[PDB]
Amino acid sequence: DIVMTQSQKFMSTSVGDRVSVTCKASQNVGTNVAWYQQKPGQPPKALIYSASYRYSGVPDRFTGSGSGTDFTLTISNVQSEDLAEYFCQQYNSYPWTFGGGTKLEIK
Amino acid sequence: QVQLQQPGAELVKPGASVKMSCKASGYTFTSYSMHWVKQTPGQGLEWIGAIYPGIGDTSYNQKFKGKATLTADKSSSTAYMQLSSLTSEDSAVYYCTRDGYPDYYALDYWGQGTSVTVS
Amino acid sequence: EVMLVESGGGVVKPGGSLKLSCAASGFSFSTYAMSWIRQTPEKSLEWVAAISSGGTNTYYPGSVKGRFTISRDKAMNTLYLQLSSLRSEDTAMYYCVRHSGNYVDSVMDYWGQGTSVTVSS
Amino acid sequence: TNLCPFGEVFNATRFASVYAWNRKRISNCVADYSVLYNSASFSTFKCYGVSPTKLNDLCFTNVYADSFVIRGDEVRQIAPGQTGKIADYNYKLPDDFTGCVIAWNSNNLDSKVGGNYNYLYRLFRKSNLKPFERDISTEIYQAGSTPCNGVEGFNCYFPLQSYGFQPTNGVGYQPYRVVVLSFELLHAPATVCG
Amino acid sequence: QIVLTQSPAIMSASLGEEITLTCSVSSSVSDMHWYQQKSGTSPKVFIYSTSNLASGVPSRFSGSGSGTFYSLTISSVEAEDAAYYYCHQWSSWTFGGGTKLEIK
Ligand SMILES: *[C@@H]1O[C@H](CO)[C@@H](O)[C@H](O)[C@H]1NC(C)=O
């Protein structure tokens, strides 16, 4: 199968800074990637699809970038809601395989 | 307004089989395929499988082939998953998601997730 | 007002014949599609024959096709159902039914009284 | 008199699937519309802007006969405005129609004991049709997020499904042959008059 | 072919309460008609085209649906509404099951 292995597991930045989390796909999954946010006790909220767009109801600091083999979710100007667990799945071929995930805590 | 609702938590004894129900409201049920995912502090998220309620075509992950079966029905307005060969390892929180391909690509709307603990 | 009564149902032998007549009165007979409907003792209704407004169309199900023949007589204002080769599964009540439109398309407005057919001995 | 061909579009030997309907352009006639309206064979003769008795006295410069075959219960979707799986994806009529929709039962010619698997219909499409836009595209429809890449495994269904026409289906699933006449007014001399 | 199923084969509602009847079709059909039959009487039409109350039925019944699911709902079940309710459409050759309703 395919696996999207995020490079790192733990980040720690303070409110008012930028943090970027990467996610590398083993095969050529094209630009078919999606990002999810989740805080403990809630379902993973949808944030980004096609690796650069934005679902209805999301701020403009949730920038998505990359394509091909590596993708990035960059959160510029971290704020009161950008502190959660972030996942990156591909869906270029069945089955869909989610990413490991990363966590953000105040520096 | 689209909402996918599910029960809270199910108590099950090992070796048995349990069924989970996910019913959605706010859209045409038969046109958007329903996916199932499983979360746990061990392996993050995993893709159980998917069901197309309109036709009935099912797809399953390699890991969960034969260990879980998905069904649905038009008049039911709810997807169902029954867990074959339960063990203490399969205690996890199971989410029901919608694909939504035409307007939005990935899993856009999620259920609340049912926490199943085999003990 | 509109009223339909049937006659001709009784006791017959297996593989025998019979002719159920339906004398309609209260409306112009040649502008409504009509049908017969049998109800078995299990209280299960079953479309068994249907004729259009004119008479150029008759539709029978797969069970009775080749044994029941529906017919219409506009002058005498009657509707006939000629049975034949009656198995033992045809014990039932038979209702004369008048559709609302000029085709078998529409709803079944008025249901006749009905007549019983018993096929044995 | 050189009457129209209405003996090769009405009582033909085999009609066409509804997803690829047959369009026959009738012109240069002296047509006889009153033979159709007084034939007692058709179960549905609905004229949608023309007086069916005043049909026989009025010139037009082109007629189009759109022949196909559907279910009896799906004939309702051949009216201006109605929607379904036929009016949406297979054959769409505009809501300014000036013609007559004709149909009759065809269980004697279009049914086999095991079933006629030759009358297809389009079950899946991206968006609805617009008036008189047939679509012969036998390529795979994708109803899921995963790209399809042209293989029909899962959420990659074949768009056309075949009617199963047995002789015992009901008076509403037996095959009904629909012939839709649509009249035209091009700024040019009138041919089809009658 | 088409099979029309009605569930359940018996229901019991206390007077003045609201009941609901379901008719599920094997495949897609446009409309659906609901007939009523009491014990010892030839049936009577109540609803045609899934939502039109016949001329004579009380104005308390209702019904709607589409595709492969239709429903007839009685708002205030009375003593008189104790009978069999069959669903049938043009495309079946056989009426539905029939949910024998009896007041509780
Ligand atoms: C089609 O052919 C039959 C052959 O008997 C004929 O009776 C009928 O009138 C014809 N219909 C038309 C519209 O020409």
Side-chain angles (χ1 to χ4, degrees):
Chain A
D1 314 326
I2 314 178
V3 54
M4 301 192 79
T5 80
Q6 314 205 19
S7 300
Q8 307 195 341
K9 178 59 174 184
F10 265 90
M11 309 289 183
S12 179
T13 76
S14 292
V15 164
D17 204 3
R18 182 180 67 73
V19 61
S20 79
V21 59
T22 176
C23 187
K24 185 155 287 276
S26 297
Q27 295 179 354
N28 208 296
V29 308
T31 184
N32 285 324
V33 173
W35 296 89
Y36 298 112
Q37 181 191 47
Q38 183 199 34
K39 292 182 74 69
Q42 300 183 341
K45 172 190 170 188
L47 285 199
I48 284 174
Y49 65 113
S50 294
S52 65
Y53 292 167
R54 274 176 267 285
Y55 282 86
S56 68
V58 67
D60 44 345
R61 35 198 161 98
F62 288 99
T63 299
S65 176
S67 178
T69 60
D70 73 321
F71 316 84
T72 60
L73 169 60
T74 49
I75 313 303
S76 296
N77 175 77
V78 166
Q79 272 322 305
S80 307
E81 186 64 27
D82 300 336
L83 296 172
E85 199 172 1
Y86 296 101
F87 300 109
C88 52
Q89 76 170 354
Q90 63 89 1
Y91 49 76
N92 211 52
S93 54
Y94 286 105
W96 310 4
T97 80
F98 288 66
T102 199
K103 289 192 60 82
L104 270 295
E105 175 164 70
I106 310 97
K107 202 185 278 296
Chain B
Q1 184 257 8
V2 175
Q3 61 95 60
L4 282 73
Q5 76 94 30
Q6 274 178 330
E10 314 316 307
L11 271 162
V12 178
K13 313 264 180 263
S17 282
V18 63
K19 67 186 289 184
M20 269 155 303
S21 75
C22 170
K23 67 177 70 176
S25 296
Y27 67 81
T28 178
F29 177 78
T30 85
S31 292
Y32 298 74
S33 64
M34 203 79 64
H35 294 224
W36 289 90
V37 314
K38 150 177 180 186
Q39 194 189 10
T40 179
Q43 294 83 17
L45 271 77
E46 301 170 47
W47 193 65
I48 292 174
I51 178 66
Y52 196 52
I55 295 307
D57 285 23
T58 70
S59 184
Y60 298 100
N61 199 335
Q62 175 210 37
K63 275 191 53 185
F64 294 171
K65 188 67 62 63
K67 266 75 76 172
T69 66
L70 314 171
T71 59
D73 180 28
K74 277 76 70 177
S75 297
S76 294
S77 186
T78 181
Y80 275 109
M81 163 167 57
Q82 80 82 9
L83 293 174
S84 283
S85 297
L86 286 172
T87 62
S88 178
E89 191 274 330
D90 290 328
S91 49
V93 57
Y94 291 62
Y95 303 108
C96 161
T97 63
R98 192 196 64 170
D99 198 334
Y101 160 73
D103 56 351
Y104 278 139
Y105 274 167
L107 316 177
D108 50 35
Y109 279 144
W110 290 53
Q112 193 74 316
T114 70
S115 297
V116 192
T117 307
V118 164
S119 175
Chain C
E1 59 178 1
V2 52
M3 184 176 70
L4 305 92
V5 302
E6 310 87 354
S7 64
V11 179
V12 303
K13 304 217 168 177
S17 177
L18 197 57
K19 199 172 187 189
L20 321 174
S21 176
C22 173
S25 284
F27 64 98
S28 62
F29 191 71
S30 303
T31 184
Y32 290 83
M34 299 206 55
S35 311
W36 283 90
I37 281 185
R38 89 174 148 194
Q39 183 178 221
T40 60
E42 287 81 334
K43 299 190 93 74
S44 82
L45 291 160
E46 183 167 11
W47 208 355
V48 76
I51 187 167
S52 178
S53 177
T56 60
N57 289 312
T58 61
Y59 310 99
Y60 302 91
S63 296
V64 309
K65 202 155 205 323
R67 323 196 275 92
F68 295 175
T69 61
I70 207 171
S71 292
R72 174 174 255 159
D73 192 27
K74 68 170 307 299
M76 292 177 72
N77 269 3
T78 60
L79 187 81
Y80 307 94
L81 177 46
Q82 156 79 80
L83 316 162
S84 58
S85 160
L86 290 168
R87 311 160 158 174
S88 160
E89 80 168 290
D90 305 333
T91 40
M93 190 85 90
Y94 284 71
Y95 298 126
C96 193
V97 157
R98 184 213 76 158
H99 297 255
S100 70
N102 68 285
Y103 202 55
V104 306
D105 195 324
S106 64
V107 71
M108 318 208 195
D109 268 343
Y110 299 114
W111 293 57
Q113 281 194 349
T115 187
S116 66
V117 185
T118 59
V119 285
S120 55
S121 295
Chain D
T1 320
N2 47 0
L3 268 63
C4 283
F6 282 160
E8 65 163 87
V9 68
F10 264 97
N11 47 21
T13 59
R14 150 155 197 175
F15 265 30
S17 299
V18 59
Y19 81 97
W21 71 74
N22 191 34
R23 163 69 67 89
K24 189 185 192 59
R25 178 176 143 276
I26 296 159
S27 68
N28 223 29
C29 281
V30 172
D32 43 350
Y33 298 120
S34 180
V35 174
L36 266 48
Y37 194 83
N38 296 114
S39 196
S41 161
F42 315 112
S43 70
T44 287
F45 197 117
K46 293 190 183 298
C47 287
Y48 277 128
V50 181
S51 296
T53 74
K54 304 289 100 174
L55 261 172
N56 219 323
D57 42 29
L58 164 58
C59 287
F60 273 111
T61 190
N62 263 339
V63 180
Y64 296 91
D66 284 305
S67 299
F68 53 87
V69 166
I70 42 180
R71 296 185 195 282
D73 198 77
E74 288 192 337
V75 182
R76 299 180 65 187
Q77 313 177 23
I78 316 298
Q82 293 258 350
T83 75
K85 288 268 175 175
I86 290 308
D88 279 1
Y89 305 141
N90 295 254
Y91 183 66
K92 179 63 183 171
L93 286 188
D95 43 27
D96 53 45
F97 201 37
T98 45
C100 303
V101 161
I102 303 168
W104 66 105
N105 187 292
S106 158
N107 191 72
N108 311 84
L109 285 76
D110 296 311
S111 294
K112 303 293 179 68
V113 294
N116 216 5
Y117 286 84
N118 294 147
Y119 291 116
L120 267 48
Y121 76 105
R122 174 166 304 273
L123 161 71
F124 284 129
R125 204 175 192 275
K126 274 309 192 306
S127 308
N128 306 324
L129 287 191
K130 60 182 180 292
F132 309 117
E133 197 255 325
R134 56 184 278 170
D135 202 359
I136 52 168
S137 180
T138 53
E139 85 175 332
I140 295 97
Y141 171 76
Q142 160 185 296
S145 315
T146 302
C148 190
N149 274 317
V151 177
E152 328 195 319
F154 164 62
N155 272 11
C156 277
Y157 324 106
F158 199 55
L160 323 175
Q161 186 167 359
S162 78
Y163 284 134
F165 280 158
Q166 286 99 13
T168 168
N169 274 117
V171 190
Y173 270 7
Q174 282 172 22
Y176 282 63
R177 293 174 157 200
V178 166
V179 169
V180 166
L181 304 157
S182 59
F183 311 142
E184 186 182 1
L185 272 303
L186 163 58
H187 273 187
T191 80
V192 179
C193 295
Chain E
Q1 40 184 320
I2 293 291
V3 71
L4 305 163
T5 191
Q6 272 189 279
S7 297
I10 197 153
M11 296 178 72
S12 298
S14 295
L15 197 146
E17 313 315 307
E18 180 169 330
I19 209 63
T20 291
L21 307 176
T22 188
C23 187
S24 180
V25 195
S26 178
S27 297
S28 178
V29 299
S30 60
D31 52 3
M32 171 84 53
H33 323 290
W34 293 88
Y35 314 93
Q36 187 217 30
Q37 177 197 215
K38 315 189 180 191
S39 179
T41 295
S42 301
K44 298 177 284 294
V45 60
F46 274 167
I47 299 190
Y48 43 85
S49 303
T50 69
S51 181
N52 307 331
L53 289 174
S55 295
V57 70
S59 64
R60 59 159 175 268
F61 291 65
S62 294
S64 172
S66 47
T68 182
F69 187 82
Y70 300 92
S71 61
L72 155 66
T73 68
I74 302 165
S75 288
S76 296
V77 57
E78 309 281 335
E80 62 186 2
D81 310 341
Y84 293 79
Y85 293 72
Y86 301 93
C87 55
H88 179 227
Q89 197 263 331
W90 176 25
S91 298
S92 296
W93 277 130
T94 62
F95 281 50
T99 82
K100 180 177 174 65
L101 191 72
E102 180 152 43
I103 188 169
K104 191 169 178 62

